[PDB]
Amino acid sequence: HINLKVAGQDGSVVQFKIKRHTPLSKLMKAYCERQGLSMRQIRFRFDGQPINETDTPAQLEMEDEDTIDVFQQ
Amino acid sequence: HINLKVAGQDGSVVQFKIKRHTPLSKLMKAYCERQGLSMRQIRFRFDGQPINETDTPAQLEMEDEDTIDVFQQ
């Protein structure tokens, strides 16, 4: 498992742990659920790159304690 | 190539060959595949130390005919 932060533009930082070869849609759906947000209303990015359904941490070269940025659509 | 043993607690000894600067995750995945085992269920150690994804034999000072120990998680 790697630990990841999800930072909103309001400064909120919400924490997840994910295995390196698990798709990040696990984390994305979880965030939407936990935070009462529509998948429809938001996008997730890492190092500027948008994150897709099957993107994995290992594939986006994410490391423990890295930050994913969340935005409005 | 160096030859390595992978010993289970049941006494089984399964043989691999690996280059000294190749990551041991090559061998680990292979063992899981060959032996019908989940990465999830098991850990690998050498001389007491856990082995990570990118650990190499040369880096763990493994030599020809050395033994890696496998355990349940």
Numbering used by the authors:
A (entry chain A), B (entry chain A): 17 to 89
Give verbatim excerpts from the published study on this entry.
Protein modifications by ubiquitin and Ubl (ubiquitin-like) proteins are involved in the regulation of most cellular pathways including cell cycle progression, transcription, DNA repair and stress responses, and their misregulation is implicated in cancer and aging. Both ubiquitin and SUMO (small ubiquitin-related modifier) can form substrate-attached chains, in which one unit of the respective modifier is attached to a lysine residue of another. SUMO is recognized by short SIMs (SUMO-interaction motifs) that have specific consensus sequences and bind with medium to low affinity with dissociation constants in the range 1–100 μM. Upon binding to a hydrophobic groove present in SUMO1 as well as SUMO2/3, the unstructured SIMs adopt a β-strand conformation that forms a parallel (SIMa and SIMb) or antiparallel (SIMr) β-sheet together with the β2-strand of SUMO. STUbLs are conserved in all eukaryotes, and the mammalian STUbL RNF4 (RING finger protein 4) complements deletions of STUbL genes in yeast.
These SUMO fusion proteins lacked the N-terminal 11 residues of each SUMO, thus retaining the natural distance as it occurs within a natural Lys11-linked SUMO chain. The last residue at the C-terminus of the first SUMO monomer in the proposed di-SUMO2 and the first N-terminal residue of the second SUMO monomer that are resolved in the structure are 14.1 Å (1 Å=0.1 nm) apart. The linker region in between comprises 11 residues and is not resolved, indicating that it is structurally flexible. Therefore a SUMO chain in solution is expected to be able to adopt multiple conformations to interact with the SIMs in unstructured regions of SUMO-binding proteins. Importantly, we found almost no difference in binding of the linear di-SUMO fusions compared with the binding affinity of ‘native’ Lys11-linked di-SUMO2 chains (KD=11 μM). This validates that linear SUMO fusions are a suitable model for poly-SUMOs and that the SIM domain of RNF4 recognizes the SUMO chain only via the established SUMO–SIM interaction and not by additional binding to the branching point at Lys11. The interaction of the SIM domain with linear di-SUMOs was stronger, with similar dissociation constants (KD) of 17 μM for di-SUMO1 and 14 μM for di-SUMO2. Elongation of the SUMO chain to four moieties, however, resulted in a significant increase in affinity with a KD value of 4.3 μM for tetra-SUMO1 and 1.6 μM for tetra-SUMO2.
